[PDB]
Amino acid sequence: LFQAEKDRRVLQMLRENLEEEAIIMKDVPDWKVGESVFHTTRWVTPMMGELYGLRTNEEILSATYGFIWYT
Amino acid sequence: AGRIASFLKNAWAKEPVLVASFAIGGLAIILPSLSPYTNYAIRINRATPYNYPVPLRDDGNMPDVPSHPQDPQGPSLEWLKNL
Amino acid sequence: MPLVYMNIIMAFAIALAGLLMYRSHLMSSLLCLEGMMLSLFIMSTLIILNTHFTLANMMPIILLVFAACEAALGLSLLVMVSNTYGTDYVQNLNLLQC
Amino acid sequence: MNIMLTLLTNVTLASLLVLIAFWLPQLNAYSEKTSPYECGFDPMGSARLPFSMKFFLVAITFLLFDLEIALLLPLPWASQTNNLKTMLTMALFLLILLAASLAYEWTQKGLEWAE
Amino acid sequence: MFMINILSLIIPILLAVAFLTLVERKVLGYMQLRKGPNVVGPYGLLQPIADALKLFTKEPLRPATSSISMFIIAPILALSLALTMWVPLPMPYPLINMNLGVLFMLAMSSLAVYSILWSGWASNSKYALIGALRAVAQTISYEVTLAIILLSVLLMNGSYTLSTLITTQEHIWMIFTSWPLAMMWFISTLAETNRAPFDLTEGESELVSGFNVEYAAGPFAMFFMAEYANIIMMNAFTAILFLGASHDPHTPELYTINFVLKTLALTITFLWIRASYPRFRYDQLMHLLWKSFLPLTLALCMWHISLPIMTASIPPQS
Amino acid sequence: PFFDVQKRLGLDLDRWMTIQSAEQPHKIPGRCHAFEKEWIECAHGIGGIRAEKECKIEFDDFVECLLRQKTMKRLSAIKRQRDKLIKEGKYTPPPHHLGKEDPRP
Amino acid sequence: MWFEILPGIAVMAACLFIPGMATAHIHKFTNGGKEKRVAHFSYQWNLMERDRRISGVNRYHVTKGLENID
Amino acid sequence: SRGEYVVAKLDDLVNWARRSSLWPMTFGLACCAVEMMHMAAPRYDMDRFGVVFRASPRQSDVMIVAGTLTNKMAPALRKVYDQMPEPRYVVSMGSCANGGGYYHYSYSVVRGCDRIVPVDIYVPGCPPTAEALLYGILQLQRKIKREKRLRIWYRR
Amino acid sequence: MTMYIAFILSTIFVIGFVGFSSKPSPIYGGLGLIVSGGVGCGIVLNFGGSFLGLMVFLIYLGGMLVVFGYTTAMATEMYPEVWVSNKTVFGAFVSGLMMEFCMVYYALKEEEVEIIFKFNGLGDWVIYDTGDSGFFSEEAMGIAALYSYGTWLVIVTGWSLLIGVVVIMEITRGN
């Protein structure tokens, strides 16, 4: 169950980032929206700069150091 | 037979700390090789499920693989609860 | 590369420059050697943790061990030189020329 | 984050205590008062003169012995492996080599201080 | 709200240190057929307050030949580290929960020796230097043995988490399993805290005052506070390590009372020891720690590695 | 020079630690296990000279996984364009990118 | 006494009582009255974050029972 | 006035703290040091008054001159007096320290330690009894109780 | 850019390296190395390496203590040097600080390549894993694998330590 919820959460965050990208870079000369950086076409686990890139510093700080800093 | 006894007596009279250390270290070296519980410790370590057990795709001729966790097939931990 | 990586690399470069530029004391150069070892430890640990190379996690510890063997070696020499001159100055090591 | 706050609090409290210690009382410092203490008479030489270490070889050995404990500290986690026989053999080998090094230093008068 | 917890840990520790001094004086007095402080306050209960007030209103001296920065920094480091060592201790809940709390105490105790080293060297006087070098020798004597004893004892805990020690000793005290290690640990804690018969760094009869001979008033007070806080902290650590109080999750103050009573017993034993023995010689301390404690500790480390595998008794945690 | 005693005796003194895709304890994978596996299976048996040219795609993907330079470049460009669009004020980022989201389990 | 040493020991015991009970009470006060959650490993941290997410008030200790299944 | 009341109260607190914690330097010269030891002995137990010996001059408040001060020794006494941080007090115990005593007409004896340092209390006797030294110490405590530094500062 | 904690720690690391590389009295060099060791322990902790950071800090503290003891005996130098007691030491310290600041400035606002690669900043939080699994510590498991996987490493390390004891006792013999 945790795996299923994690998969949906990651996919939704990626989709939201894609929708915001489609709006932000509408008028950039030759920007192809949603372009991968890998030649391969298989699934690649996101980098947490890809998931929390367009979010506030509080949730970034949580997702990065919450477990380490929790005491 | 007679030299070692005198040497041990002198060592116990003069350096009991060294005699105790050597005896304890020798026991630590020898005893594990003569104990039936070392295998049990290995089995207990092997019984701990740190990772998820990934199921196998049923090909049709694996009788020993269970189809449900409560099915009689598969490894049993009954030896552990009685230990 | 992030800023932390180049900060560690810069620390290594600074410690190497400190070793290669002797002032008078051999102990100061040995401290620079230990600093280089420390920067190497930090760099290797950061790389291993970032990439989740699990087995390589034992590598930095080993790197520490042979660091001590280098320190204990150097200190030993610093004793002998001192016993010859009453001073650990590197200027006294000039009996052999090129 | 909480440990950082704790460290900052402790250091701040200690520094504040130093500040009150140095700024609350009345200070009358003159040269005789601040002179070094050597039981009523002036020191002959400097306190920055070399001071012989008679336990220097033990001090050097302490470095290697200190790295040995760093090697031995992951043993509680190592005891959870399936290859228990191998791990036990290697742990006993490491301790035996440490004991042998201690014995070698002991027998060759390495633990006796210099006179 | 975490700041309030920090204060609730820090202020009571300092109060306990202040009254420990009064207790120390009274215990020594009654063991010497006298009374000790009984005039300043009823039963001398106001004597520590008078001592604190007197020390902080007295003139602090800065020696002419001293190095000012290290001279001022060293007492700050001493007191700050002494206060910091308390945060991972479970009583029964720690202020800071660490996976490796034992290693944290080891490292911070190893860093607390520099306050005596920097203090002695920065005083720029001969007796202070002799005290600092005695501290160097003391650490060289006890460090390896203390670490190996800690590892051997914790092999039956399964981790370096301090709260797990409560679960380990739910039915029996660890002193019934490792009393030979407990004795060596107690002696090493005496050596680590610079307490009699191992108080060489001060050495009042030999070195006048040792490393802190040039310190006066408030900085001297902070050195004293750090030393006594270290006494209480180390005895609390020993009580957690070898005399495990039973913990009721719905009734934690029962554990707190039990743990405090055990810590007070160990501290009173420290004071009792100070009043009974002559001082060691520091070379004799090194020889005691390296020729007697070290071989037995190595043998017992091998034994405590082999035993859980021998009997199939390995603790749970990874 | 290299005397391959490990290959001759089948000893495996240090080969267990050379690559991150090689039998970790508790089957814990590396961050770039698939990329390294693909590159190794591409370059196996054909020699270094051929592997440097014919397995360049797999190696470039593996390096991108290891250091993520292109990913950081792309994210930096995205955030720079977003900052430019917001400074003159015609973006108005959505409420779920500001902390006003409704989280899912 | 010899029992005149007891008042000082009692004061020390009272002072040493305060840290543990203060920590326990503050843990109860700030964690919903039911003990502070321990996260030594990432699985427990994931559980805590999930509890915070599904709580609806952004507090992990706010526990949702079988009243959320319609 | 409120300020006068406040300075008087703070003055009383500081005086109480200083008189209740008097730390003499571990320092003796002659016969009188034996009676000083007997004052520290269980029968009198100076420690119960808050009076504790300390070796270092930097951690001391009182110098008890207990014995003859000779010419050879006077610079050392002056030096360890100067290294005491303030406030500091000196008690002159015995005839030799008070005025020279039996050795008043000697080529090598300082005729009283008050030629070298200022003295707060003089304790007569050759030697004074440990009870007499205790009386002198309590008199010094009373004298410290009388002093008014904060009031004098306020009336300045 | 988030809380700048890792960057601040790395900068203090570099500053301590400059401090002990300027080569003042070895007392102050040991102090600078101790500061660098503690700060590097903090850096490693901020990445999940609790054991490694604590381990290296504990090792360094012990090592520095021996160095202090040896400095008081063989590198004493009646007027020991601080960073402001000599023009050479102060110049080296200022040069190190200025070079560190210049490199940080060049790599921070812009994206410049110094030797190998370049940097834009972005904070070190970007390159994390997102991995969500485990009832153990990966670092602890990897370190504990030394006694099952790294038999060869244990053998060579133990032989080296024993040889080191023999070697130091041979070197310091004299005669």
Ligand SMILES: CCCCCCCCCCCCCCCCC[C@@H](O)O[C@H](CO[C@H](O)CCCCCCCCCCCCCCC)COP(=O)(O)OCC[N+](C)(C)C
């Ligand atoms: C327990 C731990 C926590 C405590 C929490 C409180 C922290 C307190 C801070 C610690 C310091 C305590 C010191 C107490 C006495 C004050 C000393 C100093 O500040 O006063 C004078 C400061 O005055 C200076 O001479 C200059 C004054 C003005 C010039 C600079 C200050 C500019 C501020 C503007 C003031 C104008 C009005 C402001 C209204 C808000 C210096 O006098 P000085 O003789 O050296 O020092 C000896 C003090 N004696 C006499 C008591 C023994």
Ligand SMILES: CCCCCCCCCCCCCCCCC[C@@H](O)O[C@H](CO[C@H](O)CCCCCCCCCCCCCCC)COP(=O)(O)OCC[N+](C)(C)C
């Ligand atoms: C052919 C050469 C022989 C003569 C020359 C001697 C020079 C070499 C020095 C010693 C040689 C021994 C090294 C052999 C490599 C050890 C690794 C291999 O043999 O297997 C190990 C077997 O090691 C066992 O512990 C027994 C060997 C240990 C021997 C004790 C130490 C003796 C060395 C003494 C010589 C070194 C220098 C002198 C020191 C005093 C562990 O196997 P296992 O754990 O199942 O599986 C691991 C893989 N897993 C994790 C995926 C499951």
Ligand SMILES: CCCCCCCCCCCCCCCCC[C@@H](O)O[C@H](CO[C@H](O)CCCCCCCCCCCCCCC)COP(=O)(O)OCC[N+](C)(C)C
């Ligand atoms: C929140 C706290 C902040 C500051 C912290 C500092 C600690 C607070 C101060 C502690 C106060 C305790 C002192 C009171 C003890 C007096 C005991 C009494 O017996 O003394 C009497 C006289 O007492 C003194 O005259 C007055 C003492 C106190 C005067 C005012 C106190 C005001 C303190 C308020 C706090 C101010 C701190 C400011 C900073 C915030 C006479 O006794 P004495 O003759 O000797 O003994 C003779 C022995 N015999 C009897 C056997 C023969």
Ligand SMILES: CCCCCCCC/C=C\CCCCCCCC(=O)O[C@H](COC(=O)CCCCCCC/C=C/CCCCCCCC)COP(=O)(O)OCCN
């Ligand atoms: C088989 C397993 C062994 C490995 C495990 C050992 C664990 C750790 C113990 C070893 C640590 C290193 C010990 C160092 C060796 C010391 C050598 C030495 O020099 O000792 C001499 C002393 O000579 C000796 O070696 C002591 C006597 C012989 C050694 C001890 C006894 C040998 C083994 C006895 C126990 C064996 C089993 C017990 C028998 C049970 C009864 C049947 C020291 O005397 P001095 O310092 O010169 O004294 C000066 C002041 N007068």
Ligand SMILES: CCCCCCCC/C=C\CCCCCCCC(=O)O[C@H](COC(=O)CCCCCCC/C=C/CCCCCCCC)COP(=O)(O)OCCN
């Ligand atoms: C079936 C096998 C299982 C394992 C077998 C284990 C059996 C163990 C049998 C022996 C165990 C003894 C452990 C004791 C370790 C040290 C003993 C020792 O030998 O040290 C002494 C000295 O040790 C001391 O006496 C220390 C002196 C300092 C004393 C300080 C105070 C005394 C202690 C007070 C009580 C301590 C209470 C500890 C427990 C507290 C709770 C944790 C050596 O000194 P020397 O006489 O000079 O001889 C060598 C030179 N020829």
Ligand code: SF4
């Ligand atoms: S006054 Fe009398 S008892 Fe005291 S020192 Fe002089 S001769 Fe001795």
